[PDB]
Amino acid sequence: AYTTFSQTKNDQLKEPMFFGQPVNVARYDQQKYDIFEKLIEKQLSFFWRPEEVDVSRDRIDYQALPEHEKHIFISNLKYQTLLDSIQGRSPNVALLPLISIPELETWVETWAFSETIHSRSHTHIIRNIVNDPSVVFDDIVTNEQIQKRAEGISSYYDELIEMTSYWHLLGEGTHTVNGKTVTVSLRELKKKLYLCLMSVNALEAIRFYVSFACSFAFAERELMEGNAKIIRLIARDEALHLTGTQHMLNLLRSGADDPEMAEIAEECKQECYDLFVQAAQQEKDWADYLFRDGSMIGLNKDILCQYVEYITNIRMQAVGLDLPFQTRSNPIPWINTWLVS
Amino acid sequence: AYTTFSQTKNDQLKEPMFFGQPVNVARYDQQKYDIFEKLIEKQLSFFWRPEEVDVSRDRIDYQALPEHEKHIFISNLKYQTLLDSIQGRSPNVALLPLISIPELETWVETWAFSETIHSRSHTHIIRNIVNDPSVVFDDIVTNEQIQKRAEGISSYYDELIEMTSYWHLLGEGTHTVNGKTVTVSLRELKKKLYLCLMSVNALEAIRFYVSFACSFAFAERELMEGNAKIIRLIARDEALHLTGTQHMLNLLRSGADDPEMAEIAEECKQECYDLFVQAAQQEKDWADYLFRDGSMIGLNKDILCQYVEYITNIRMQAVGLDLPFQTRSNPIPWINTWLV
Numbered sequence: 001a002y003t004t005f006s007q008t009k010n011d012q013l014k015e016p017m018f019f020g021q022p023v024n025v026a027r028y029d030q031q032k033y034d035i036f037e038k039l040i041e042k043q044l045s046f047f048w049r050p051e052e053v054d055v056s057r058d059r060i061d062y063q064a065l066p067e068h069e070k071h072i073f074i075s076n077l078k079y080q081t082l083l084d085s086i087q088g089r090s091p092n093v094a095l096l097p098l099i100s101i102p103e104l105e106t107w108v109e110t111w112a113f114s115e116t117i118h119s120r121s122h123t124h125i126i127r128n129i130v131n132d133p134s135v136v137f138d139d140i141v142t143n144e145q146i147q148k149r150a151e152g153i154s155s156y157y158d159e160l161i162e163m164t165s166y167w168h169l170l171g172e173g174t175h176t177v178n179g180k181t182v183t184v185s186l187r188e189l190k191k192k193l194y195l196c197l198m199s200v201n202a203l204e205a206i207r208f209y210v211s212f213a214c215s216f217a218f219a220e221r222e223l224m225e226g227n228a229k230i231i232r233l234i235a236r237d238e239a240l241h242l243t244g245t246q247h248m249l250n251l252l253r254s255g256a257d258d259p260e261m262a263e264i265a266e267e268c269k270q271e272c273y274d275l276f277v278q279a280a281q282q283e284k285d286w287a288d289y290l291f292r293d294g295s296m297i298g299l300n301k302d303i304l305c306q307y308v309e310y311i312t313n314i315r316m317q318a319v320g321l322d323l324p325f326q327t328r329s330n331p332i333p334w335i336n337t338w339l340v341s
Numbered sequence: 342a343y344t345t346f347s348q349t350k351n352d353q354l355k356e357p358m359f360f361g362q363p364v365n366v367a368r369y370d371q372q373k374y375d376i377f378e379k380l381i382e383k384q385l386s387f388f389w390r391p392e393e394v395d396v397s398r399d400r401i402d403y404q405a406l407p408e409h410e411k412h413i414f415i416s417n418l419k420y421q422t423l424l425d426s427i428q429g430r431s432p433n434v435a436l437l438p439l440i441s442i443p444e445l446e447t448w449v450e451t452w453a454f455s456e457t458i459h460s461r462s463h464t465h466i467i468r469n470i471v472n473d474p475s476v477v478f479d480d481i482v483t484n485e486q487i488q489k490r491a492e493g494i495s496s497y498y499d500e501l502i503e504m505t506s507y508w509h510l511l512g513e514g515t516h517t518v519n520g521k522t523v524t525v526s527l528r529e530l531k532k533k534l535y536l537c538l539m540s541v542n543a544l545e546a547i548r549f550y551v552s553f554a555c556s557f558a559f560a561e562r563e564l565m566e567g568n569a570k571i572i573r574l575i576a577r578d579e580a581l582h583l584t585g586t587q588h589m590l591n592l593l594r595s596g597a598d599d600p601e602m603a604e605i606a607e608e609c610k611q612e613c614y615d616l617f618v619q620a621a622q623q624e625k626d627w628a629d630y631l632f633r634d635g636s637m638i639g640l641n642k643d644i645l646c647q648y649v650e651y652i653t654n655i656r657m658q659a660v661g662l663d664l665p666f667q668t669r670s671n672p673i674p675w676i677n678t679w680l681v
């Protein structure tokens with residue numbers, strides 16, 4: 001039931017963002033939602049190559065860092081590397097099969113592409129600061145504290161993908177497979193998509209943002225400046241990515257795109273609220289682990305805890321959720337220097 | 342059983358290209374096959390923005406073409422628009438879920454991205470040479486002769502995706518699904534992927550080169566120069582794309598990757614041959630439609646037929662297949678100018 005070229009002539013301006021007729025012709029002269037075309041144009045305008053950033057002094061900077069600061073630096077970078085590894089592939093494997101307007105289709109492929117550039121940039125840094133990159137790369141997979149902080153990201157995508165496959169193969173209904181009942185409901189699949197996109201919003205809008213504070217705290221001391229330049233370019237992309245998910249989510253909950261989806265979103269208001277708080281809690285928990293045997297000029301576990309609360313309130317507000325934390329001004333206004341957006 | 346972040350610490354240098362553990366960490370410091378890393382670098386080096394291309398003279402040129410030349414030009418562009426629509430999405434939906442080495446995964450995503458840029462360039466031209474783009478785009482979907490020429494492309498991808506979903510959901514074996522016996526064979530799925538790759542090779546290496554020749558026949562008349570600029574950029578990318586599939590296919594044939602894929606390539610040899618012979622015939626058949634209202638000096642059914650045979654023999658040789666066609670020299674050596 002999925003096809004790479006639906007042979008039915010359809011009005012692409014009238015399809016929903018998701019679950020409609022798969023996109024046939026790729027055209028960009030018109031859109032149902034011009035935000036997605038504007039994001040494509042902007043991301044293309046921002047194209048960069050990691051190899052064109054001078055990183056030659058980052059190795060000696062890193063080596064001269066006190067052992068606990070090396071630990072803060074490398075652990076933060078390993079988590080960034082985990083997140084971009086996942087985001088390189090997942091928007092394509094998880095969202096593309098479900099998209100039914102051309103502007104959003106191409107936005108997702110362009111988004112995913114920009115993520116692979118991010119992963120390439122993380123290799124560029126690692127190669128240039130450690131003798132054996134394999135040690136860093138292997139620790140990403142098995143590192144207990146990172147299985148923990150991002151515990152649950154791959155599962156949301158994975159369940160969405162599995163349910164999408166059942167939907168595409170069998171359609172809605174009550175089915176049997178090898179002696180067991182398998183229920184496929186479009187409503188449940190819409191719910192999974194909604195929560196997946198909420199989680200992707202928290203990933204890019206908060207999890208990655210909190211990581212920028214660690215990277216740019218070294219930059220403020222004129223250390224790891226090659227890395228800083230790369231993270232700066234990544235943050236400029238991230239601003240677009242979270243703008244895309246913000247719009248998808250707001251168009252889904254308003255009811256202008258799919259009334260069923262607006263019901264679903266109201267229905268999981270509490271669940272979503274609680275998912276946001278958990279992501280924030282996970283990032284707080286990591287902060288402590290980062291800072292377990294020392295702190296830095298400009299950063300420590302309580303400052304980065306406050307930043308997690310600050311950023312979380314802003315993002316939740318932006319997608320129409322209640323604020324879990326005490327309202328405060330930015331605890332690290334110096335970071336605005338680096339977040340050019 | 343697909344996962345976006347596989348949990349086992351595996352040696353990515355020892356996975357197969359396809360069907361191994363899904364890639365976890367995306368790293369570019371090492372490769373099983375450096376050709377794919379070299380292709381990513383080159384394609385990134387070629388980044389272009391379609392809208393920056395000046396096509397302001399193409400509307401003048403186009404509107405002044407005789408009607409039969411408008412037909413030739415726009416039928417060709419509509420077919421290019423079809424193939425890049427499919428290619429923008431298909432490598433990511435059909436291949437990406439089966440890749441087990443990071444360099445191949447990222448190449449497939451870069452390749453696909455580059456195809457969405459091709460599609461964006463077709464919009465750029467179309468919107469600047471006609472007053473209603475929708476008539477052009479709508480016709481791509483319903484045009485009986487366009488779809489006849491493309492028959493089998495989306496069908497092949499679609500079949501591979503369905504079979505892949507069954508494999509990820511149920512695993513190998515014989516299953517009972519809504520009372521029907523469904524066999525999931527990894528060997529059969531490997532054959533499907535393998536022949537999909539062969540078909541993609543024919544698509545980029547033959548079907549698109551035939552279309553380039555029709556595009557450049559106008560450039561040779563000093564017409565449609567914005568478009569020719571765009572097609573030259575497209576062709577530069579296409580050369581990388583076909584290099585990628587040639588190397589995937591030839592590495593599989595070698596036995597140096599998955600040994601079962603090497604058995605499959607040999608076993609399915611005739612199927613490989615047949616699919617190239619059918620694609621070539623479809624490209625020939627398109628001539629009657631293309632030249633329906635008349636042909637052009639140096640571009641007609643005979644010339645097109647000759648070029649199809651010429652290029653098909655070259656691509657077939659490059660992946661170890663016998664040649665179906667009589668050997669010939671290039672019937673349109675003027676195209677070399679445009680193909681750098």
Ligand SMILES: [Hg+2]
Nearest residue numbers: 094196197200
């Ligand atoms: Hg998602």
Ligand SMILES: [Hg+2]
Nearest residue numbers: 156157196199
């Ligand atoms: Hg998700």
Ligand SMILES: [Hg+2]
Nearest residue numbers: 076210211214
């Ligand atoms: Hg941090």
Ligand SMILES: [Hg+2]
Nearest residue numbers: 191264267268
């Ligand atoms: Hg819900």
Ligand SMILES: [Hg+2]
Nearest residue numbers: 265268269272
């Ligand atoms: Hg919700």
Ligand SMILES: [Hg+2]
Nearest residue numbers: 265268269272
């Ligand atoms: Hg909600």
Ligand SMILES: [Hg+2]
Nearest residue numbers: 198272275276
């Ligand atoms: Hg949420």
Ligand SMILES: [Hg+2]
Nearest residue numbers: 284305306308
């Ligand atoms: Hg906190």
Ligand SMILES: [Hg+2]
Nearest residue numbers: 302305306309
């Ligand atoms: Hg706090």
Ligand SMILES: [Hg+2]
Nearest residue numbers: 497498537540
């Ligand atoms: Hg294919």
Ligand SMILES: [Hg+2]
Nearest residue numbers: 551554555645
């Ligand atoms: Hg031609």
Ligand SMILES: [Hg+2]
Nearest residue numbers: 606609610613
């Ligand atoms: Hg073959």
Ligand SMILES: [Hg+2]
Nearest residue numbers: 643646647650
């Ligand atoms: Hg011929």
